[PDB]
Amino acid sequence: MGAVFIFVGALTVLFGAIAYGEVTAAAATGDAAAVQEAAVSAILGLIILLGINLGLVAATLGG
Amino acid sequence: MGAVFIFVGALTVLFGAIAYGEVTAAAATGDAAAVQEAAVSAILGLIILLGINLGLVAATLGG
Amino acid sequence: VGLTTLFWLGAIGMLVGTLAFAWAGRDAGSGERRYYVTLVGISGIAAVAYVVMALGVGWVPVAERTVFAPRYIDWILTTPLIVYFLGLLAGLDSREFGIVITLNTVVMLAGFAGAMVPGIERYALFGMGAVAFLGLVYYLVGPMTESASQRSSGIKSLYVRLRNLTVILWAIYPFIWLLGPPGVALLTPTVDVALIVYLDLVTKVGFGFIALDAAATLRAE
Amino acid sequence: VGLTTLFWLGAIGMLVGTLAFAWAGRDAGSGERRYYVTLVGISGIAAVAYVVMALGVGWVPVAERTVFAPRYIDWILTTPLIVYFLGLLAGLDSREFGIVITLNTVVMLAGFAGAMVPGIERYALFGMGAVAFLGLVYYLVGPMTESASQRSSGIKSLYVRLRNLTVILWAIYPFIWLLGPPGVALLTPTVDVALIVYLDLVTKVGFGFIALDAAATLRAE
Ligand SMILES: *C/C=C(C)/C=C/C=C(C)/C=C/C1=C(C)CCCC1(C)C
Ligand SMILES: *C/C=C(C)/C=C/C=C(C)/C=C/C1=C(C)CCCC1(C)C
Ligand SMILES: CCCCCCCCO[C@@H]1O[C@H](CO)[C@@H](O)[C@H](O)[C@H]1O
Ligand SMILES: CCCCCCCCO[C@@H]1O[C@H](CO)[C@@H](O)[C@H](O)[C@H]1O
């Protein structure tokens, strides 16, 4: 389970970094609507990511 | 495990809704930097939320 | 969603737990009574603290942020009750109880003090709390686990499950302190409060429900 | 991070899996060979598809979005291999294999076709895929599970674990289709690609590693 968890924990921060980069890039623009757009994507993406990680975990540490 | 998962799945969308509301509220402002601020909080918050959910799941469906 | 709305959600969640723990305990003999009473104290105190914050009391301005005194006061009162519940399962003696409650209290006192300090030296107080927390974790997974392993199967199993919930989840709180208003304020006040409501609900009410579920099973075999 | 960088990460992840599956299989007798070969095909095909996208090929403009033909072509080729692997574990006969591969192929064909359709009628194609997917899930958790339950303990256990991984995770793909560029485009192209890389890696390489870990254990007792 260990290798599974740090895989999950590490990919989450890596996904968060990608999402953050998208938000900062949109921020550099000065367009508020662009940032909202990148942010809505990041939020939906992170929610889906939970589903994936939870799915992976439930599937491997379940029976 | 079922009641645990839909508790986790439902609180995640509820947290995502709070985060989204914060981003839209900042968006209504027209300030790009404000939106980035709300978005960075949402991203960090969602990452922490994964940790909580994963922690809860690992702790209850583990041994 | 406003802060007061989140605080009200916290209060209601804690009340629901408190009612559940009280009623579950109505079916309890001399040996189990203290556990149910402990759970009632834990969620009851938290319920009142949340009401206090929802009613707009204890919001303390600190420099350019807002710290919630009742949050930290709740923790000072309820976390030693959680440690007590765990110690009962583990089969600790008074001297062992004294050590872990002391370590626990240092964490909560340090964290509260640090939140109330405007200057950079608040991180020294955080640091003192963080070291004490590592000591508490050691006690939970080491000595206390060894003590628990001498008890019945059902008791050892509940201890490990609640120990795991506690160690993993309590470890998240200092990151919320660091990233939230008391630290570098990257989490908004709203996200900070929302995370703490959820986390408090799991560490108190989730903890209790896990215990309720195990207690029913042990008594039914 | 650019799209091509993500595609390269996908290709490397798939290559690492492919090398692992090939080498693990070097230790394999007549009974286990086909499973290892199947895993190599699954991750190998995916590795090449990712290279194709990383090299900037197959990026198809559709209205105001970009659809990746090699993504859908990969799925058309590799998902029936995953269904095949599961069917082997379950102990299916040719007629049973034919049903599930057919249902699987309808999902992937419908999803690819829908992604390539500019108009609102692409959701009808999605819908056709979604219904076929519910049929596939039924087959996986019903008939195929019943077939698997007649085999050895070690085999039934691997089947259920891989079945659970597959059903839960494959169910996420249509939501990414709906929320991403092919649907309402709420996910950016980058987030869309990043989610699919991770998901593909778990459903192919994670799947394979779970199988590798079980195979070693069965052979070592
Ligand atoms: C019901 C409330 C619970 C279980 C609260 C738990 C809070 C903690 C474990 C806090 C720990 C902290 C540190 C380890 C460092 C200093 C900051 C604290 C107080 C947030
Ligand atoms: C290695 C790649 C894998 C396992 C791909 C799996 C993809 C699916 C399960 C896609 C399913 C879809 C639906 C159920 C509806 C139509 C849209 C699809 C094709 C994305
Ligand atoms: C919320 C309910 C938690 C119940 C956990 C019970 C754990 C302690 O177990 C109790 O200890 C008694 C001795 O003190 C004995 O009668 C029995 O071992 C048992 O009833
Ligand atoms: C990646 C490795 C997966 C190996 C899974 C093996 C599952 C099938 O099991 C194999 O089937 C053979 C009959 O066909 C028999 O020799 C044995 O039951 C076994 O070796």
Numbering used by the authors:
A (entry chain B), B (entry chain B): 22 to 84
C (entry chain A), D (entry chain A): 2 to 222
List sentences from the manuscript.
The photoreceptor sensory rhodopsin II from N. pharaonis (NpSRII) in complex with its cognate transducer NpHtrII serves as a model system for studying transmembrane signal transfer. This complex displays a 2:2 stoichiometry where two transducers are flanked by two receptors. The long rod-shaped cytoplasmic domain consists of two HAMP domains (present in Histidine kinases, Adenyl cyclases, Methyl-accepting proteins and Phosphatases23), which are followed by a methylation domain4 involved in the adaptation processes and a signaling domain which harbors the CheW/CheA binding site5. HAMP subunits contain two amphiphilic helices (AS1 and AS2) joined by a non-helical connector.
Here, we report on new crystal structures of the ground and active M-state of NpSRII/NpHtrII1–157 complexes, in the space group I212121. Interestingly, the orientation of symmetrical parts of the dimer of two proteins is “U”-shaped contrary to the “V”-shaped quaternary structure reported previously (space group P21212). Having established that the fine structure of the proteins itself in the complex in the two crystal forms is unperturbed, we analyzed the overall structures in the crystal lattices. It is evident from Fig. 4 that the two receptors are oriented nearly parallel to the transducer and form a “U”-shaped binding crevice in the new crystal form I212121 compared to the “V”-shaped structure in the original P21212 symmetry. The angle between the G helices of NpSRII in the “U”-shape and the “V”-shape is 11°. A single NpSRII monomer of the “U”-shape dimer can be superimposed with the corresponding monomer of the “V”-shape dimer by a rigid body rotation by an angle of 8.5°. When comparing wild type structures solved in the I212121 and previously solved in the P21212 space groups it is seen that the structure of NpSRII is nearly the same (with backbone RMS deviation of 0.22 Å for ordered regions) and is highly similar to the structure of NpSRII when crystallized alone (with backbone RMS deviation of 0.27 Å for ordered regions). Having two data sets from different space groups (I212121 and P21212), we checked whether different crystal contacts have a structural influence on the retinal-binding site. As can be seen from Fig. 2 there are almost no differences found for the ground state structures as well as for the activated M intermediate, indicating that the different crystallization conditions and space groups have little, if any at all, influence on the functionally important regions within NpSRII. We found that only the “U”-shape structure allows a close interaction between NpSRII and the HAMP domain, allowing it to be compactly fitted into the “U”-shape topology. Here, we have presented the structure in the space group I212121, where the whole complex is more compact (quaternary structure has a “U”-shape) and the receptor can extensively interact with the transducer’s HAMP domain.
